[PDB]
C-alpha cells in the first residue's frame, strides 16, 4: 500500500509501426513491342510480371489480408502504402542531361517505327507508347519512399518497382532503364534536407552494373556507392569501366565508391554473406550513413536464367536483418531487375518477414565454402579503400611492387625442406638415399627404402616441394614467418607403404621459377623415370606390383614412362594428385590400347575450379573432379580410397 | 485527368479467406520474472556497520534495474512486487522451487544438505562458512528462498521452448557462474545457469538438443565451465579478463586455448582480455569475428544468454568502457543466428548504474527494436585484441569449416600435433630458416649455436659465433622472423613459393661484420613459437637478455665496444636491458631498423643518462609509409624497409666506423 510508481505510458521507439511498401498497378504497362519470335524463347528480360508474383507471395502468405490482389485502403496493422503521384523534372535533372529528358518527353508523341529506330540505337533497351509516367513514377516514388524513410514515417520501406533505373546514364541511357530512380532520390533527399539526410549509403547487388547510378554520385562524397555485379567487359551486359574496382570516386568522393564484380555466374550464399560481412559492415559504420538505399535485382539468384546462381532466399533475409541493424531503421530496400519469376518469390517471402520484424530463418546450406573468385576479388578493393579509409587500415595490416632486382642474393627456400624431410624420414622410417648419379639433381633427393631389389611391390612417390602455409600478422605489414607451417604432403602414403612393408622410393622435384607449368621439373621427371626404368628395374628380376604416385607436378614424366616404355609388364596402376596443375594426357603412340588401359586402371584427381568443368577426351583417362581444395585435402582425405583402389589393383 | 481508369464494376471474388496469419516470431511478448523472495539472503557483518557500502551481491540491484524498467512505463503495478498485470507489452513468469531432483542432477548431496544446514546454522557458524567457503555470503535463512533462483532458472525456459514467449530474461540473485557440484565461490549459492541449462534438455529432449551459451560477464563463468566441459551438445562462449590469476577467478581454465574436453571439444570458446579498459570497438569487432560464422555453421536450438555488465561504461571492477549501445547491438544481431531461441540471465554488473543503462538498452532492443548506432564509428581497437583473435581463429580450422577457406587457414590443420613428429605433417618453418641458416652459415663460415639451457624453449633457436669469449668486439644482431613478398593466395593461407622473395637483411650485417672480423650472437625471436601457448616473447626475450648480460657478457676477458643491432620489434627488449643494466662503458653503439613497427616504452633502471648515452649511441631508421627526444635519433627515411636498408646500411656502418674513426 506504500506506493513508488503510478500507471504510466510505455516508452519505445521502433515496432509499434508498420512496413511501408511501393507498388503500383500502372508500372506494368511499360513493355516490349513485338518484333521477333526469339523474344518468346528469351526469358522476357524485363518482364512486367515480376511485380505481382512477389505481390502474390506476400499477400497469400498471410502478411496482407486482401480479397482482390489490388488496392483496398484497409491495409491491416503491418503494411503502409506510399502514395505516388506524377512528379516533376528538376529532380530528374539533378542527374540527367535535359535533352535526355526531352528524348523521353518525345516518346509521349512518337510513332512506332521511331521507337524501333531508338531501340535499335539504344544499348539493349526497350520502350513503349506507355512509358512516360513509367519513367517518372519510379523516381518520384523513390523520393516519396525515402522522405518517409529518414523522418521515420515508415519503420522500413521497400519498392517492388519496375522499370529499373541503374542503366540510365545522364547523357543517353542504354540498358532497359528509362530514368534512374535511386540516384534522383539520393540527390533530392540531400538537397531537400541536409539536416536529417547527412550521408547515404547506396548498395546494389543487381548483377548488371549500376552505370546509371554510379556517375550521378561518382563525384559526390555524401553517397557511399557500393556496387555488386558481373563485370564481363563486353560479353554480359554492360561491362563499363565504371564497374571496375579502380572507381574509388572522384575528388571529394574519393573513397566513397566501392565496386565488387563477379567473374562467373553460379555462386551461392556465403559468397554474398562473407563478402557482406567483410566490406559492408565496417565502412557502413565508419562512413556513418543515415539511410542505406538497398538495391535488389533478381538477375542474381537461384533459378535465374542468366545469372544462374545458387543463392538462397535466407542469405537475402540475413543481409536484410544486418542492414536493418546497420541503419537505425532508415531502410529503403528497392528492386531493379529480374528474368525468372521463381527466384523472386522465395526471396521476397524470406525478406519481407524480416522487414516486418521477424528474424530470418536458419541457413539451408550453412556450408557454401565460397568460390575463390569471391575470395580473391575484394582484396584489391580493400587495398584502394585502405588507401582511403581508416576502417580497413590496421584491421588487416594495411597502412595506406617496388623492386625486382634483389633476386641474386636470396634465402634459397627449398634446401632445408628436403634436408628436414631427409632427417626425419631417415630416422623414423630410415630412408636410404640411393642416388641417381650421372644426372643433375641434389644428392639427398631420391630416398629409397633399403633392399628395394628384393622388395617386389614398389610404391614410388614423386612430388614437388612441400606446401608452405603461413600466417601474416595484423599489426604492421609483413608475414609472420615462424608460423609458416611446412605441409609435408608425402608422409601418410609412405606410412601406408611401410605399413604393408613395400619398397618405398620417394623423389622430390625442385620446381621451376615464375612459371605457369612446372616444365623443367617435368623434364627431369622424364630423366628420372626413363633412367630408373632403363637402368635398374629391368635388372631387378624379383619385381611385381609397382605403383607410381605423383603429387602435384611432373605427371608427364610418368606419362612418358607409360607411352614410351612398356613399364606395365611389372607396374599396374598410376596415382596422381594433380589438383590445380595442368593436364598431362597420355599421347597414343604405339596404339590407343595402352591409352585404353590407362583409361581403365589409373587415377588422376584435379580441382573443382581447375581448367575444365565450365565431356573431355579418353586420353586424359579418368580425371576426377574434387571440391575439397588443396593437395593436402585430398592427400589426408582420400587416403582410404587410394589404399582401396591400388590394393584392388594389387591383391 | 488520367488515361486508363479500369472498369471493375463487379463483386470482386475473394482470393484468400478469413484466417490467422503465418507469422512465426513476435505475436507474443517478453517474459519477465520477479519475486521479492530473492531479495532476502545477505551477509553477517563483524567489525563495523558495513551498510555504508552496498556489497557487490546485493538485494536491491534487481530492484534498481527493475525500477529503471518501472520508469519506462512497462509496469502498471504500484507496489513493484511480482504480479502479472502490467499493460500489453510483456508478460510475467511464475517461480516454483528448484526441487532436489531438479538440482541434484549435477550437485553433490553434501552441497544440498549443507545449504539446508546453513539454513539453520548459528551466527558464529554463518561467519565460519563465510570465511571457510570463500567469497560466499551467509545468514540464517537460505533454503526456503535459495530454491527459487534455480527454480525460476528452470521454469522460465519452458515458456520459451513451448512458444509462449519469443525470448525472455532472467533477473536473478545470487549468481551462478562460479558454482560447482562439490564447491562454490563468487557469491554463488547454486549454479543458476547450469541448473538453467541442463533441465530444458533433460525434461525435453524432444525439441532442443544443442544449446549455445553466451557469457560476457568479465569474471569467467568458471563453475559452469566445468559443468558442461565434456558435454558435446552445449557450445559455450565466455569473454573475460585473465590477468595471470589476479582477476577473479583467474585460473588456467579461464584461458582462450580451452577448446573443451573429451567429446566436448569445439564446444568451449574463451576470450581473454590481456588488458582492460575496452570499449565498444573490441566487442563489435569480436562479436562479428567468431560468434556469427560459427553460429551460422553450428545453428543451435537454444541460446542461453549469460549477461554481465561488469565491463560496462560506468562499472568499476571490470574497469572497461563498453557503452550500452554496444550491448544493444550485440542484443540485436543475435536474433538472426538462432531462430530467436534466446533467454537472458543476469550474471554480472556491480556498479548500480552501468548495469541499469546497459540492461535498459538490452530491454529496449529485445522488446523489438534496433539500438542506437555506435557514437564512435572510427573506433579503432587495441591491436593486441585483433592479435589474440587471430590466435582464436588460428586453431578453429582444426575443427570448423566456416573459419577455414575464408580466413586463409585451409592448408594447415592443427589436428596434426605441430612438431617434428610424423603425425604432424605440418612443420615449423622458423626451424627450417634456422636449420638452413645453421647449415648455410656452417658451410659458409663455420657458425655455431647457443643453448638456451635454463630457458623454456627448444635448443636450436639462437646462434652465435665460435669463441664469443675472445671476441673482443661484439655486434649483437637481434632479429625477428624475416620478410617475404608474394601474391596472396588468400583461399588457403598457403603461398606461391615462386612469387615469394625472402630477404635475409640481417645476414648482410653479419657479412659486413665479417668485413669487421668481430663477434656476433645471432639472437632470434620466433614470435612465441606457439607451443607453450600462454606466451609473450617480449618478456621472455628480456629474460634471455638478462640471461646473456648477467650470465655471460660482462664476465668476458677482453670485452669492449659492444654493438647492438635490433630489428623492429626485436629492438624492444634492448629498450629493456639497456634500461635495466648499465652497459655504457662497454657499448660503442646500438642500432635499430624499426620500419613501420610501433615505439617501445622506455624503462630505465640504473641512471638517467641512459637516454642521452643511447641518444649518442643510436642510429634508428624507420619506414616512409610508417610516417614516423628520449627515443634516440629516430630517422624516418625515404626510399621505402629494404630500400632504406640499402639506403641507410652505409649510414649505420659509417657511424660505426667513425665511432672507430
Ligand atoms: Zn536492375
Ligand atoms: Zn562480474
Write up what this structure looks like.
Chain B: GO terms for molecular function: chromatin binding; histone deacetylase activity, hydrolytic mechanism; identical protein binding. Chain B: The active site is at residue 178. Chain B: Keywords: Chromatin regulator, Hydrolase, Nucleus, Repressor, Transcription, Transcription regulation. The structure is cut from a larger assembly and holds chains A (651 residues) and B (661 residues). In chain A, 31% of the residues lie in helices and 14% in strands. By secondary structure, chain A is of the alpha/beta class. Chain A is elongated, with a radius of gyration of 32 Å. Chain B has 661 residues and is of the alpha/beta class. Chain B has a domain at 30-399: Histone deacetylase domain (Arginase, Chain A, 3-Layer(aba) Sandwich), CATH 3.40.800.20. Chain B is 28% helix and 12% strand. Chain B is built from 19 helices and 16 strands. The longest helix of chain B is centred in the middle third of the chain and has 19 residues, at 280-298. The N and C termini of chain B lie far apart (99 Å). Chains A and B meet through helix 2, helix 8, helix 9, helix 13 and strand 12 of A and helix 1, helix 10, helix 13 and helix 14 of B. Bound molecules: zinc ion (ZN) (2 copies). One zinc ion is lined by residues 217-219, 308, 310, 348 of chain B.
Amino acid at each position: 500500500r506504500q506506493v513508488i510508481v503510478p500507471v504510466c505510458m510505455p516508452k519505445i521507439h521502433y515496432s509499434p509501426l508498420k512496413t511501408g511498401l511501393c507498388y503500383d498497378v500502372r508500372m506494368r504497362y511499360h513493355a516490349k513491342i513485338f518484333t521477333s519470335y526469339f523474344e518468346y524463347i528469351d526469358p522476357h528480360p524485363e518482364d512486367p510480371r515480376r511485380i505481382y508474383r512477389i505481390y502474390k507471395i506476400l499477400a497469400e502468405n498471410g502478411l496482407i489480408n486482401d480479397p482482390t490482389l489490388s488496392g483496398v485502403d484497409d491495409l491491416g496493422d503491418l503494411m503502409l502504402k506510399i502514395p505516388v503521384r506524377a512528379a516533376t523534372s528538376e529532380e530528374i535533372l539533378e542527374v540527367h542531361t535535359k535533352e535526355h529528358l526531352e528524348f523521353i518527353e518525345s516518346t509521349e508523341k512518337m510513332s512506332r517505327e521511331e521507337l524501333l529506330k531508338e531501340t535499335e540505337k539504344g544499348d539493349s533497351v526497350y520502350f513503349n507508347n506507355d512509358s512516360y509516367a513509367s519513367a517518372r513514377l519510379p523516381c518520384g516514388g523513390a523520393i516519396e519512399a525515402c522522405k518517409a524513410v529518414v523522418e521515420g514515417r515508415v519503420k522500413n520501406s521497400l519498392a517492388v518497382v519496375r522499370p529499373p533505373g541503374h542503366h540510365a546514364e545522364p547523357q543517353a541511357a542504354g540498358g532497359f532503364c528509362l530514368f534512374s530512380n535511386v540516384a534522383v532520390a539520393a540527390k533530392n533527399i540531400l538537397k531537400n534536407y541536409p539536416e536529417s539526410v547527412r550521408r547515404i549509403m547506396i548498395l546494389d547487388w543487381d548483377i548488371h552494373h549500376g552505370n546509371g547510378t554510379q556517375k550521378s554520385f561518382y563525384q559526390d562524397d555524401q553517397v557511399l556507392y557500393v556496387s555488386l555485379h558481373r563485370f564481363e567487359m563486353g560479353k554480359y551486359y554492360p561491362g563499363t569501366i565504371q564497374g571496375q574496382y579502380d572507381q574509388t570516386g572522384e575528388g571529394k568522393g574519393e573513397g566513397f565508391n566501392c565496386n565488387i564484380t563477379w567473374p562467373v555466374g553460379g555462386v551461392g550464399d556465403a559468397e554474398y554473406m562473407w563478402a557482406f560481412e567483410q566490406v559492408v559492415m565496417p565502412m557502413g559504420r565508419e562512413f556513418k550513413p543515415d539511410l542505406v538505399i538497398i538495391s535488389s535485382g533478381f538477375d542474381a539468384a537461384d533459378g535465374d536464367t542468366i545469372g544462374q546462381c545458387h543463392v538462397t532466399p535466407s542469405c537475402y533475409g540475413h543481409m536484410t536483418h544486418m542492414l536493418k541493424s546497420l541503419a537505425r531503421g532508415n531502410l529503403c530496400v528497392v528492386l531493379e531487375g529480374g528474368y525468372n519469376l521463381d527466384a523472386i518469390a522465395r526471396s521476397a517471402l524470406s525478406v519481407a518477414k524480416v522487414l516486418i520484424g521477424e528474424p530470418p530463418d536458419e541457413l539451408p546450406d550453412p556450408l557454401s565454402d565460397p568460390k575463390p573468385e569471391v575470395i580473391e576479388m575484394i582484396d584489391k578493393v580493400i587495398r584502394l579503400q585502405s588507401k582511403y579509409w581508416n576502417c580497413f587500415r590496421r584491421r588487416h595490416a594495411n597502412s595506406g611492387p617496388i623492386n625486382d632486382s634483389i633476386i641474386s642474393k636470396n634465402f634459397p627456400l627449398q634446401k632445408a625442406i628436403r634436408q628436414q624431410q631427409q632427417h626425419y624420414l631417415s630416422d623414423e622410417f630410415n630412408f636410404v638415399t640411393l642416388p641417381l648419379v650421372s644426372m643433375d639433381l641434389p644428392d639427398n633427393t631420391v630416398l629409397c627404402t633399403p633392399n628395394i631389389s628384393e622388395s617386389n611391390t614398389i610404391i614410388i612417390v614423386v612430388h614437388d616441394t612441400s606446401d608452405i602455409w603461413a600466417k601474416r600478422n595484423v599489426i604492421s605489414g609483413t608475414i609472420d614467418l615462424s608460423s609458416s607451417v611446412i605441409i609435408d604432403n608425402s608422409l601418410d602414403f609412405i606410412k601406408w607403404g611401410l605399413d604393408r612393408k613395400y619398397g618405398i622410393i620417394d623423389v622430390n622435384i625442385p620446381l621451376t621459377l615464375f612459371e605457369p607449368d612446372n616444365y623443367s621439373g617435368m623434364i627431369t621427371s622424364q630423366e628420372v623415370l626413363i633412367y630408373l626404368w632403363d637402368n635398374y628395374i629391368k635388372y631387378f628380376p624379383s619385381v611385381a606390383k609397382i605403383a607410381f604416385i605423383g603429387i602435384g607436378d611432373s605427371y608427364s614424366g610418368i606419362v612418358h614412362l607409360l607411352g614410351h616404355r612398356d613399364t606395365r609388364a611389372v607396374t599396374k596402376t598410376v596415382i596422381n594428385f594433380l589438383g590445380d596443375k595442368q593436364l598431362k594426357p597420355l599421347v597414343p603412340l604405339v596404339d590407343e590400347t595402352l591409352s585404353e588401359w590407362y583409361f581403365k586402371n589409373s587415377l588422376i584427381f584435379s580441382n573443382n575450379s581447375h581448367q575444365c568443368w565450365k565431356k573431355p577426351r579418353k586420353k586424359f583417362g579418368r580425371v576426377l573432379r574434387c571440391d575439397t581444395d588443396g593437395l593436402n585435402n585430398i592427400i589426408e582425405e582420400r587416403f582410404e580410397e587410394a589404399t582401396d583402389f591400388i590394393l584392388d589393383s594389387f591383391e
